Design a protein around this ligand. Structure first.
Ligand SMILES: [Fe+3]
Length: 159
């Protein structure tokens, strides 16, 4: 099992209720911490307006919420590929540079997103000496340190 977390930089100040219009980094379309949990969570909060497949695709609803994102594997909305790093033609593929837990974290690090949807070991694995420059967005409207994932995660995931 792992925990799904939302990583942000200590320089910013927005909370979970303020995500509309920000830029986002995801591990890839359809993955647990990078898509299913965060998108699902926002739909239920009522922040992302989707009521059912008859109100469009999930992709279109997300592209209207974030100003732009990198979502490796996205199929219909080019806005979901706009922050992706790489060659014009392969940047948004499932195995592209900002794909995966590492690649999504690197997208936040390089300033291409305001938030990365990754898992609880991600920051320690990829930036152990810079852990203090990041924090997590909690469901209750606060921020907590990276090592506080147990009390600041969006869900526990089966894997
Ligand atoms: Fe995963």
């Amino acid at each position: 099992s792992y925990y799904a977390v939302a990583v942000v930089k200590k320089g910013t100040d927005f909370m979970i209720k303020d995500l509309r219009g920000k830029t986002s980094c995801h591990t890839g379309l359809g993955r647990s911490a990078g898509w299913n949990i965060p998108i699902g969570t926002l739909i239920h909060r009522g922040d992302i307006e989707w009521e059912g497949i008859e109100s469009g695709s999930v992709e279109q609803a997300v592209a209207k919420f974030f100003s732009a994102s990198c979502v490796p594997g996205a199929t219909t909305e080019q806005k979901l590929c706009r922050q992706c790093k790489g060659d014009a033609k392969t940047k948004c593929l499932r195995n592209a540079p900002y794909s995966g837990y590492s690649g999504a974290f690197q997208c936040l690090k390089d300033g291409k997103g305001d938030v990365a949807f990754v898992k609880h070991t991600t920051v320690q694995e990829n930036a152990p000496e810079e852990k203090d420059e990041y924090e997590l967005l909690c469901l209750d409207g606060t921020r907590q340190p990276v090592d506080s994932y147990k009390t600041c995660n969006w869900a526990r995931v089966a894997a």
